[PDB]
Amino acid sequence: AGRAALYKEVYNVIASDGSYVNYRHMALLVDVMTTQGGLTSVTRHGFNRSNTGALMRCSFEETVEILFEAGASAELDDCRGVSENVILGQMAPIGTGAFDVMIDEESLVKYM
Amino acid sequence: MFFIKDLSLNITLHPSFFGPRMKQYLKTKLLEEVEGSCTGKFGYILCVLDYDNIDIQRGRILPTDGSAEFNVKYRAVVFKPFKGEVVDGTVVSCSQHGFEVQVGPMKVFVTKHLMPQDLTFNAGSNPPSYQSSEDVITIKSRIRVKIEGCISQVSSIHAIGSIKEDYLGAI
Amino acid sequence: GQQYSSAPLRTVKEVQFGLFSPEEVRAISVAKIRFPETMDETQTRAKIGGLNDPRLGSIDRNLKCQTCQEGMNECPGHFGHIDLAKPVFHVGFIAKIKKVCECVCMHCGKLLLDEHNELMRQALAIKDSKKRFAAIWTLCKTKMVCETDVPSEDDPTQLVSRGGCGNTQPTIRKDGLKLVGSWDEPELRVLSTEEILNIFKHISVKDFTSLGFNEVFSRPEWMILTCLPVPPPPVRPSISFNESQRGEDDLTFKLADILKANISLETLEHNGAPHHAIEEAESLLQFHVATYMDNDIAGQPQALQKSGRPVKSIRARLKGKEGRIRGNLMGKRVDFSARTVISGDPNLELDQVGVPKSIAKTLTYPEVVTPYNIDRLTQLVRNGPNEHPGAKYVIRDSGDRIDLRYSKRAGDIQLQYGWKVERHIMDNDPVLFNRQPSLHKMSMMAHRVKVIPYSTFRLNLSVTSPYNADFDGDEMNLHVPQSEETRAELSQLCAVPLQIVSPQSNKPCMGIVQDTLCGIRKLTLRDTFIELDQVLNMLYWVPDWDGVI
Amino acid sequence: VSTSTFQTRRRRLKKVEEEENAATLQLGQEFQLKQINHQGEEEELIALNLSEARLVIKEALVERRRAFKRSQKKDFMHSETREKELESIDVLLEQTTGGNNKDLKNTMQYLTNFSRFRDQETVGAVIQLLKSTGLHPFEVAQLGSLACDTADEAKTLIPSLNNKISDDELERILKELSNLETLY
Amino acid sequence: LKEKAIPKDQRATTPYMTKYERARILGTRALQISMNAPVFVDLEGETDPLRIAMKELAEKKIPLVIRRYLPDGSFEDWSVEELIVDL
Amino acid sequence: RLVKALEDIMVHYDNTTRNSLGNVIQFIYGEDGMDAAHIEKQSLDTIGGSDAAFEKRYRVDLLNTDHTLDPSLLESGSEILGDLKLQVLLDEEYKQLVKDRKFLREVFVDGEANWPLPVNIRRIIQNAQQTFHIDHTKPSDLTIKDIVLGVKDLQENLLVLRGKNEIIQNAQRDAVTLFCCLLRSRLATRRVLQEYRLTKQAFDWVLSNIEAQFLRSVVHPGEMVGVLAAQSIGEPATQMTLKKVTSGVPRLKEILNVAKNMKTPSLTVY
Amino acid sequence: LRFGEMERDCMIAHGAASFLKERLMEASDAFRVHICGICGLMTVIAKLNHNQFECKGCDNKIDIYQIHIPYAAKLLFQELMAMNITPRLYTDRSRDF
Ligand SMILES: [Mg+2]
Ligand SMILES: [Zn+2]
Ligand SMILES: [Zn+2]
Ligand SMILES: [Zn+2]
C-alpha cells in the first residue's frame, strides 16, 4: 500500500502539468524504492549503502571515503556494474554487450 | 620418467582465416607455439599426441577487431628431471672442469670435484678424456649419472649429477 | 599503447581491495629514497638519486627505468618507498581505529565478549561485515573494563573464566590527530601510535574475521603506516618552461616536507632530546602525512605552501565534478568531435545533417585497404587533403604513419591490402549528432551526412523538438565513429527514423511546426484552390510522385 | 602465449607456497597422484619409460604423416632394426615437424639408442608385470627403464622403494625383465 | 565450478533476434568483411561491407552464433540460422 | 540522481528486470513485458454502457426469433436457427464476456475504457476492409465454430514467456489477461458478422496480423530500462514552469528525499 | 569536445556498447599495461625489446598479463596506492556469479 500511494502521488506530480508518462517508468522507480523492506531513499545515505559494486557507488557524491572503507574492509567487486566497465574502458554488459558471439565451425565449413 | 600431460592454450585468429581452412591452420600454429618449448612449470614440450582428434570448440570474437580467440585442449608428451633421478646418457662436451652428459633435450653437467679420486683428467689426448685406474671416459662413452641439481633458465633446463655414488659411472 | 608485447591480453572480472603491508611496499619499491632534493646533481641539470627517479619514472624524453626504459610514452612509472621514524596514523582510518580500540581492551588485546554472551553470537550471525562491525561496536562500547570471569549460560553461581587481564579501559575520543583516554578521579595518558600498533598486532584471528577484516588483504594493523609508498613521476608532474626552469607538483613538496620532518625526528633519536619535545615534530610528521593525503580536514589544520596555495590534496584530485572520477573516467574530451552554430534547412530530410566543407576535410575516418574499394581509396589519396573528397593520412601494416600534406611520395603511393586510409567524411555517413544538455535519450541521434558550404550545421526543422534547440545561436555537437561495427551500431540503433516513437510517452516526439504547420491549415480548406500551372510544380516537388496527373 | 594445465587452482595473494622437488616421490604440484583429466576424471598419473615413449611418438608421427597427407591434393614402412630406424626417423621428422624442434630430434636419438626394447608386446608384458606390483608410476617408469642386476643396486638407484618391496621378491621381477629384452 | 550448458531442448529464450543482437551481428560481420574475410554470398557488385553483411544476413549464410547469457551464469547457444529476424 | 540511481537496471533474457547484483526488481518489465513503443490508446467496449446495450451488442441466441442473427449476415444463418449444439459455445462466449465486464469494472473502478494497449485493432479491421473489399451486402462464409474456436486458439499463441513449469504458465496468463479482454471486445460473434462483414480469409488474416504485431511489441532483452525511465521522468520535470498544497518541483524533492516533515501533510477521509 | 556523463547516460539508454567503449578508449584516453598474476598491481617491469617481464618481490616471470584500460584509470590506481590501498586486478572470477 505504501508503494501504491507513492506511485499515485508521483503520478499527480507529473500529471499536474498534464504531461503524460507511461506507467512502466514511474512504476519501475517506485518498485526500485520499495523492493528492499521499506522506503529506500534516493540520496547519498539512501541507496548508495547497498551491496552494489564499490566503484559504482563510488561515482556518486561521497566517493573518496567510500573507497577508503572499501579498501579497509577488504571489499571485492563484481564488475557487473555499468559505471565500472565505463571506468575500465571495456564493453559494458549493456544491450549490445549483454551477450557473446562465436563462430560455429561446422556451419562455417557448410558454406562453399 | 617421461610424462603425458593435458594442456590448454589460447590462440587468437585474424578474420582472414574465417573459412573451411580454419580448423587446419589453428593446429598448424599450435605445433609452432607448443612443440619445442620448455618451462620449469611442465618441463619440455616434445610431441603433441592424436593430431587427428584435437578439440577446438567455438571461439569468441574480440569486440573491437574481428579477431577470434580459441581455447584448445590437447595432450602432449613431456619430460623434466628431478633430484636424485638416476638416468643413463652420453657425453657431448668435456674439458678440465668436468664433462657434460646430454640426456634427451637436456644438458646434464658433472664436475671434476664430484668424480672419484682414482679417476683423473687427461688433456694430452684428442679428444680429451678422463682416465681412471681402469676406465676411460671421452665423448661417445655411456655413463649412468644420478642427477642432484636442476636449474631452469629461459627456454632450457640444466642439471648437475654425480658418478661418485655406487652403481654409477660408465655402462 | 603501441609496441607489441608477448603477453596474453585479457579482461577484468574481479577487483579486490586490500591494504598495503609495509613488507610488500618494501618488496616492490625500486629505490630507497633518502634525499629530499629534487633534480640537479648539486647544481647539475640532471637528477639526484634521491627523489623522482633514483631508478623509477623518466622525464625529459630519456630511457632509464631499471632497464625497462621504453621512454615516457610506454613506461607506467615504478613505485618507490620511504621509511618512517615511527608509526603514524592514516588520515581516513582514524575514525575506524578510534572505534576499534573501543571494542578490544589493551594490555592483553582480545575481544571483550565471548560466545557465552548471547548478544555476541547475535552479532556473529549475519555474514554482512560492515553491519557485523557496527553491531560489535554497539556492544563493546559500554565495556570500559576488561573481563576474565563471567557467569555463562547456566546460573550466576557458575563463574566461567576466560583469558586473563581485566584492566580498566579508557573513554577514548579523537582530538585533532591524536586520541584521548581517561581511566577516585580518572587519569590521562597519551595513546601513542606504537601502543595502538603493538596491541592491534596481538588481536586474535577470529577477532580479525569478526570485525570485517581480512586475513591476507586487509588486517587492522595495516591501518597504521610504517612505510610510505612513493608515487612515480607521472602522478606528480613537472610542468616547466624554457629549459632552466622548474615547476614541480604540490605532491612533490608535501612528500619533501614529510622527508624533512622524518629526518628531523630520526636524528632526534640518536641525539639527546626530551620526550615532550620530539613529539612536537612527531605531530608535525603526522601532520604532513595528513595534509599530503587529505588537506580539506574538518579540523583546524589547513596547511598552505609558500605561495598561499592551500595544496591540492590527493582526495581533492578524486572527488567528483571536474575530478578524477566524475570529470575524467565518466566523461572525457574525446577526439573526432565538432561543434558550431546551427540553422534549419527545409530542403533536407530528417536524418540528414549539413556539415560544412572545412569540418569534412578536418574530420577523418579510418578505412582499410580492400579489393572492394581500392580504386576509390587510391583516388581519394591522390585528391589530397585539400580537394574535398580527399584524405589526409595513410598507415602501413608495419604501423607506420604517412602524412599527405607533407611527405614527398604525395602523388606516388602504392596502396597494399591490409593498409589503412584515413579518408575525409563524405555524404550518407553515420554520425552522432547531439545538443547539450543530454537529459534525454532523444538528445543524441545518428544522422546521415550531407556536405555543404558555409560554417553552419544544417539540420531539418521537424527534429528541433527532441533536441530542444532554437536558432538564436545555439551550438551543437557532433562525433564521428571509427570502426565498422560502431557505425553499424549508430545506423541500426540510433538512427533518427528509429527514434520517432518516444518510449517515454508511447507517442511520436517529432511534429510539424511553424511555416509548415501554419499554411497547411490554410491549404486544407474548401476555400483553398490551385490552378494547373502551380499544381504541376507542386506534384514535381513530391520526390516519390508516381507521375500520375 | 602460455600453456595452462588441467589441474588449475588459484592461490590468491599467497605468492610464497611451492614445495621443493625430491627423489623420494616428491614431484611438483602438477605431478601428484591421480591428476585431473580435462574430461573430468581423476586419471592416474601417466608415466612412461625408454623405448616405450619412442613408440608413442612413433604412432603420433604415423597419424601425423597420414593425416598430414590426407589433405595434400589440390601402405606402411616399418620393421627397421637399429640403424635402419635411426636413418628412417630423420626424413619423417623433417616432413611432419617444423624442423626447428631440435629437442625432438635429440629426444628421439636418446629414445632409440638407449631403447630397452623394440616390440610393443614385450613392453606390454612389462607394463602388466610392473603395474601388477602396485607401485608408484615413477617407480614403474624407473624399474621400467634401468638395468639393475642386484636388489641392492635397484634399492640404491631408487630411494623410493626401500620398505615397499622385499629384496628377493624385487629380484623376481628383474630376472624376468632381463629375459624380456630385444637383443641388438 | 562446472558448466551450465543449457541443452538444445529446454530452450526458454525468445526465438527472435533482438535489435541489439542483430545490430551487433551486422556490426561484427561487416567489420570482419572489411578485415578481408571470406564472404559467403555472391556480392553482385557490392563494395560496402555493411551492405555485404546485410546480404549475408538475408540469406542466413553467416557462420556466427549468439551466446545468450542468463543472470545465474547459464547460457543458451543460438545460431543465426535458427533465429527468426522479424524486426 | 535518478539516472545514477537506476543505470544498471535492464530487461534480462527471461524478461526479468534485475540490477548488477541480480536481485529481481520486476518479474516482467512494466508488469506486462511489453516495449513502450508499440502501445496505443484503445477503448475496451466490454466496460461502458448499460446492460441493455451490452446484451444488444454481444448476445447471440440461436434458439429465438429475435436473438439469432439474420440469415443475411451468414449463409448458414437459416440452417443454424435452433441448432442446440452450437448454443453451448455461444453461451460459453457470452459467459466469458460477462466475466470480463465484471473483472474490468473491478480493476478499473473509474469505468474508464480508453487505455493504452499493444496491437491497434480498429485499424487492422479497416485494412481487411479496403484490402479484401468486402461489401456489406453479401453474407459471410464463416461458421460460428471458426469464430469462437478461432479466437480461442489464437489466445493460446500470444506468448510473452515461453516456459514449461506451472509457475511460468500462470506468470504468462497474468502477463496477458488484460489484452484478451479487448480481443473479445472487438471479436464478438455479433460484431464480427454484424458490424463489419468478415470473410474467412480476412478473418485468418486478422488473426495472423494480430499474432505478429503482438509478438513484435515485446521488450527486447538488453533494453536498459533504468536509464530510460530515469530520463523519461527527468525530462518532463525540466518542462515545469511553476487547494494551496505542495506541488511541482519542491514536492518532488520531498518525495525523492523521503522526508518525514513534508510541507503540506493533509489527508482525505471519505 | 567534452563527452560528459549525460552523453554517457544517453548512449547507455540506446544500448550501443561498442560505441561507448570506442569513445572511452581509442577515441580519447586508452593505454596498455601489464599486470602480475599474484598481486593485482602494476609491478611488472616491461622489457618489450627483450620479452622480459618479472614481478620482483612476488617473483613471477611466467604468469603475467596485459590489459587495455584508460590511462586515467591507471593513474587512479597509482593514486589509491599512493594512499596505501591495493586494488587487486584479476582477470578471472572465482564466485560462480
Ligand atoms: Mg538559447
Ligand atoms: Zn620504466
Ligand atoms: Zn584484556
Ligand atoms: Zn606480484
Numbering used by the authors:
A (entry chain A): 1343 to 1454
B (entry chain G): 1 to 171
C (entry chain A): 3 to 185, 195 to 560
D (entry chain D): 3 to 76, 112 to 221
E (entry chain F): 69 to 155
F (entry chain A): 840 to 1081, 1092 to 1119
G (entry chain B): 1128 to 1224
Quote the original article:
Using pulses from X-ray free-electron lasers (XFEL) with sufficiently short duration to outrun radiation damage, the structures of biological macromolecules can be obtained from nanocrystals at room temperature. The resulting method is referred to as serial femtosecond crystallography (SFX)2. Our DFFN system reduces sample consumption up to eight fold compared to a GDVN, can inject crystals in their native crystallization buffers, and is suitable for time-resolved mixing experiments and future high repetition rate X-ray sources such as LCLS-II.
To conclude, a new injection system for SFX experiments, referred to as a double-flow focus nozzle (DFFN), enables structural biology experiments at room temperature on samples of high biological importance as demonstrated by the first structures of RNA polymerase II and HPCD determined at non-cryogenic temperatures.
